[PDB]
Structure formats: structure tokens, C-alpha cells
Amino acid sequence: AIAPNTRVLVAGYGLPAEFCVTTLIGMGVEIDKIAVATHREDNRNCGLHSMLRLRNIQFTTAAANSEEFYEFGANFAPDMIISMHYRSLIPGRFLKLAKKGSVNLHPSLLPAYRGTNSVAWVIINGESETGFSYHRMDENFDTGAILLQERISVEETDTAFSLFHRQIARAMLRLEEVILKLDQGDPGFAQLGEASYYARELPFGGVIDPRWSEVQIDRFIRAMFFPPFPPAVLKIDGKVYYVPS
Amino acid sequence: AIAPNTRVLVAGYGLPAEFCVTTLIGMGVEIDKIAVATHREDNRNCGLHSMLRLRNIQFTTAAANSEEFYEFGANFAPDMIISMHYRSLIPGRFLKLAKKGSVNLHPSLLPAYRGTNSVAWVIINGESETGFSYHRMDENFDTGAILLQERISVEETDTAFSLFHRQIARAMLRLEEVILKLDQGDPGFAQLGEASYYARELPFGGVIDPRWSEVQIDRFIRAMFFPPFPPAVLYYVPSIDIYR
Ligand SMILES: Nc1nc2c(ncn2[C@@H]2O[C@H](CO)[C@@H](O)[C@H]2O)c(=O)[nH]1
Ligand SMILES: C[C@@H]1CNc2nc(N)[nH]c(=O)c2N1
Ligand SMILES: C[C@@H]1CNc2nc(N)[nH]c(=O)c2N1
Ligand SMILES: [Cl-]
């Protein structure tokens, strides 16, 4: 069991954050010992936002770099911070508020696929294996010590869509164990191997390079499939076509 | 892996439904092979509705006993139906649409704690263990064949609140397995054991009887604890700590 009176601050967004809050409640963390930092109510965040209002869990939507956010953290005085698809870089001083530190879920086997769009890139690059990494947060993205990783096979029929959702689902299986590792002061291990990096931008601006091989085009089309967003674009005779995927 | 082109209708509500759709998408079920029947958008169902809108997943909020609900299922032609906290009785003729049948998640070890508010009665009644049952649905609530059960210990500090949430979390962790049972035509097993049934309201209109033992009082307090609902009353008593 988690230490009694453990104070947990969840920074997050959407279903993973809703699930994390559910998990914490299920672990017996009291409502007054849960706080959430999230973003302004969205499509993807209606679930979380309504849950927080309904249960009277304190929350902020202040920007991560704002004073209000820092005060929210400070007044709460978390023991631990759990980032569950929180979009923004969390300032180091906010992290320092939690003397048991923090954990964040990243959908790659770090230090591979640092950056964003990790699911799309894994597919673009023809990986047959990827995974997720619950890792302590340091002041930069994607760099902190690994608390838990798990491998996820990439199938030749996976899309960014299917892999993204499997990533979430599979990662949720491990969440309770991760919270316990935090609870118990598991230092985790410094990330190992060579880091790869991918830019915030949509891969190749969503545009198929005609010089790619068919295998690379197939991968890219899959990597680009993510309803409701536009699919991969093919330009022909100066004109845009969305692929059927 | 789930059979290609399997068509899945999720009848559900709130996070368990959202998690189910997420699980399906991860399993490679395409959006046009998912349909959702749910209830209106509300404070416990907006996450699901937002997902359905964002991903353009076809859905209905028609009442379970309505022609519109039936026509939604018939049009979609599910292979399987997954009920994830769907409140209402799904009519037999709707279940009949899915050749691979259905499963529903019920937060007890069926046939114990049929009915509603199972988590609160589990605590009131002093159970030391409970669990969840993924069971095929027949025409009645809570009576169909068991596909999967998992036991959950009920701790001395558990409240209706914590147990309700742990039920969901733990049950979600078995969902993928259950969907694959459905896919594979696992017949499950006929329910066996001591049936019980509890409905709706906890007794005593939330009122602590000082004749009860401290063990009874503590259980009642914990069973009544479920933000944002009022707690047990003696004046409002949200913990035994406060009670003493
Ligand atoms: N995880 C991760 N996210 C990033 C990185 N760079 C940018 N982002 C995300 O995309 C936004 C940049 O506009 C940030 O707020 C992050 O949400 C990175 O290196 N790692
Ligand atoms: C994805 C998350 C969100 N924000 C983070 N903030 C810091 N500081 N460090 C991080 O690693 C992360 N990753
Ligand atoms: C809880 C769920 C919701 N609806 C059901 N409908 C039928 N027919 N059979 C059922 O068992 C159930 N249980
Ligand atoms: Cl039970």
C-alpha cells in the first residue's frame, strides 16, 4: 500500500490522467491529498475536468510556466508528482516541490525517441518493437531516470492511431506499480544507450516524398493515420491529395 | 490478435467505456467497426462523448428500450457487444444481434451482489473480499455466464469511493483479455454460488445507529463515503476518526 497521507499531484490531460486519478483513489489516496494540474477544458480533457469538479478535487489550468501554477503546487505540497500526458514542460522548481520526486509517461523506450510524435516515428522508421517509459522528470524533456519500461510490438498493420491507443492502454496496466515505486523511493536507473530525437513538427509536414520506397511510403501512410486529422498528403502535378490510407 | 474486421458495439458510460474504446483502437479495431451506445453527455460521461465526437465514432444515446437503440445496433451489425457500465437492461433482441454474444462488467463476484451499489453493500456487510465479473449477458441483469473474475481484497480503510475506483481500474486491466475471450467464443461458465441482490439506496437513510458495534459503524461510515454525496449522519460523519 501507498504510505498513508501521501499527497499526489497529477499533472495531466485526458484519459490517462482520468485513469491515474481513478487509480490513486483506488489505492486509498484521500481526495484532499490529490491535486491536478491540467489544461483548459478541451475535447480530450472533458472527462478529467468533469471528474475533478464532480469529486471536488482541487485543480489548476494555469500555464506550466506561470506563477499561479507554481503557487498551486506550493500550497498543495505534493509528496510526488505524476505527469500523465501533461503537455508542457514542467519547471524544475515545481518538480523540486515533491520530495519523493516525479514520474512521467513517455511512449517510447527512452532514450530512443526523445521528442514528440514518438509513435509516428517508430512506425516511419520501421521499428518492430517500441515500448513505454515511466521515468522521473528532470528539468528537460525525456531525460530522467527510468522507473519502469515495457516493450510493445509494432505490427505491420499498426497506425499511429492504433499504436498510440495501445501505448496508453498497456501503460495503464503498470501505473499502480509505478506509483508504488515512487512511494518507496526507487531511484530508478539512468537512461542507457544512444538517444534519438524527433522534432515537434509533424513528420515531413505530413507529405509523402516521392523518392521514398514503397515500404517507406506504406509506413508513412500508417504513421500519418490519426483520426480526425488529415492523412498523409501526396502532391501530384502541383496539387494536394489526401491518401486513402 | 482479434479477428480482422470484427465489429464491436460498446454499450457503456464514462471512463470504463472510454477505456474500452481506447483498448479496441489499440487492438486494431477500426473506427468504422466500433459503435457506441451510451447515455447523455453528463459529468461522468463527457470523456466518452468527447472521444466519440473527436474520433467520429458513431454512437447513440437512445434509450435501451427504444426502437432507435435497436435500429442503431441492427444497422451496425455487431459481432460482439461489450457493456461497460451501461446502466440499462439491454433487450434480448438487441443482444441477439451479435453472433459472438456479449460481455458486461459487474463489480462483484457474481452471483453474489447482484444489483446496484454493490461496492457500498460489500463494505456495509463487512465483506473482506469482493471482485469483478465479466459475464456474458442474457435477458436478465447479472445472470449470464462468467467469462472472467478477479478478486479484490476489501481493506479496513476502504470506502465505497476507493473500492468503486479500484474496481474500475483493476477491471480495465483485464479487459483486453476478455475481449479476446469473446473473440474466441469462450462460452464461460454458468454462475454458481450463493446469490444475493442489493438495490439502489443504502439503508438507514445514511443514519448511524448508536446501537451498532464500532465495527458496524466504521463499515457504514466507509460505505457511505463517496464524494460528492453526503456522508453518513449521526452531524455529517465522513470517517470513524471524526466519529469518535
Ligand atoms: N516529450 C517531449 N515533448 C516535447 C519536446 N519538445 C516539444 N514537446 C512538446 O510539444 C510542445 C512544443 O511546442 C511542448 O509543450 C511539449 O508538449 C520534447 O523534446 N519531448
Ligand atoms: C512529457 C513530460 C511533460 N513535462 C515534462 N517536464 C519536465 N520537466 N520533464 C519531463 O521529462 C517532462 N516530460
Ligand atoms: C449491467 C448490465 C447492463 N445491462 C444488462 N442487460 C442485460 N440484458 N443483461 C445484463 O446482464 C446486463 N447487465
Ligand atoms: Cl463480491
UniProtKB/Swiss-Prot annotation, chain A:
GO cellular component, one term: cytosol
Entry keyword set: Lipopolysaccharide biosynthesis, Transferase
GO MF terms held by the record: GDP-mannose 4,6-dehydratase activity; methionyl-tRNA formyltransferase activity
EC numbers for this chain: 2.1.2.14
Catalytic activity as recorded in UniProt: GDP-alpha-D-perosamine + (6R)-10-formyltetrahydrofolate = GDP-N-formyl-alpha-D-perosamine + (6S)-5,6,7,8-tetrahydrofolate + H(+)
Phenotypic effect of disruption: Deletion mutant is completely O-antigen-negative.
Binding site for (6S)-5,6,7,8-tetrahydrofolate: 88-90, 138-142
This protein's pathway: Bacterial outer membrane biogenesis; lipopolysaccharide biosynthesis
Stretches assigned to coiled coil: none
Domain of life: Bacteria
Gene3D superfamilies listed in its UniProt record: 3.40.50.12230
Single Gene Ontology BP annotation: lipopolysaccharide biosynthetic process
InterPro entries in the record: Formyl_transf_N, Formyl_transf_N_sf
Quaternary context: Homodimer.
Function: Involved in the lipopolysaccharide (LPS) O-antigen biosynthesis. Catalyzes the transfer of a formyl group to GDP-perosamine, leading to the formation of GDP-N-formylperosamine. In vitro, can also function on GDP-3-deoxyperosamine, thereby providing an enzymatic method for producing a novel trideoxysugar not found in nature.
Family of the protein in this entry: Belongs to the Fmt family.
Protein's recorded name: GDP-perosamine N-formyltransferase
Species lineage: Bacteria, Pseudomonadati, Pseudomonadota, Alphaproteobacteria, Hyphomicrobiales
Gene: wbkC
